[PDB]
Structure formats: C-alpha cells, structure tokens
C-alpha cells in the first residue's frame, strides 16, 4: 500500500480542491495526506487559524461519498459532474467537507485513497 498504491501516492503529494459552502462560496483549498497515513493537512483562511487546526485525523472520518450525496453538494454543485465531487463525513462535530476535484482522476484518488485508509 501507500508507496505502491497510486491513489495514496497522489494524496501524499496533495491536491488543490474546491471547498463548497454555498452558491457563491466555492474556494480553493489544498489538502495533503501526511506520511504517517494518519492525518490530513488542510489549508485554512480562518480568522483565528493555527497549525493544529489545519490537521485532522483519518480516525475522525465516518465515510467518504462520491457524487452529489450531501445537501450541500446537491444544492450548491449542480453544475459539477458526478465524477468530480465527493464528501468527507466526520464522527464528531466537524462539519462535512463537500469537495470538487479538478478532474475525475483526482476525485478517484481521494475517494478510493481515503476508503483504503479508513478500512
Ligand atoms: O465565510 P468566510 O468569512 O470566508 O470564512 C469561511 C467560512 O466560515 C467557511 O464556512 C469556513 O469553512 P468550514 O465551514 O469548513 O469551516 C472557512 O474555513 P477555512 O478557511 O478553514 O476553509 C472560512 O474561511
């Protein structure tokens, strides 16, 4: 795995994805799976951000959905194809991340890659 898995190799490099929050709010955010295959670094532009706030554990993930499988994606990303969007659902209070991949290969890597680590 990891070194031999093409999805995980892609995630270790990181990707520029678009985070969907509303009709207007759709902004670029860089995500990158860390070498320990345990955490993900995420770009943030929050008023009071911090290095620890920009990491989240794979252990906090319930599932990763492909396609328009969330309200936010069903309402705000109609213009985006089914194969270029996905969502990361969390176990705790962390809000679900609705994401748009620059290409189907990217969405594939994230969904498949995270599913491999979660299971
Ligand atoms: O609306 P503003 O003032 O632009 O600020 C963003 C807004 O609060 C988003 O809801 C938030 O995403 P989450 O809901 O996922 O926190 C994003 O965080 P981010 O910068 O960490 O993506 C903020 O920057």
Swiss-Prot record:
It comes from the Eukaryota. Residues 10-119 form the PH domain. The production of the second messenger molecules diacylglycerol (DAG) and inositol 1,4,5-trisphosphate (IP3) is mediated by activated phosphatidylinositol-specific phospholipase C enzymes. Essential for trophoblast and placental development. Binds phosphatidylinositol 4,5-bisphosphate. Interacts with TGM2. It comes from Rattus norvegicus (Rat). Residues 19-46 are annotated as: Substrate binding. Signal peptide: none annotated. This is 1-phosphatidylinositol 4,5-bisphosphate phosphodiesterase delta-1. The chain holds residues 12 to 130 of 756 of the full protein.
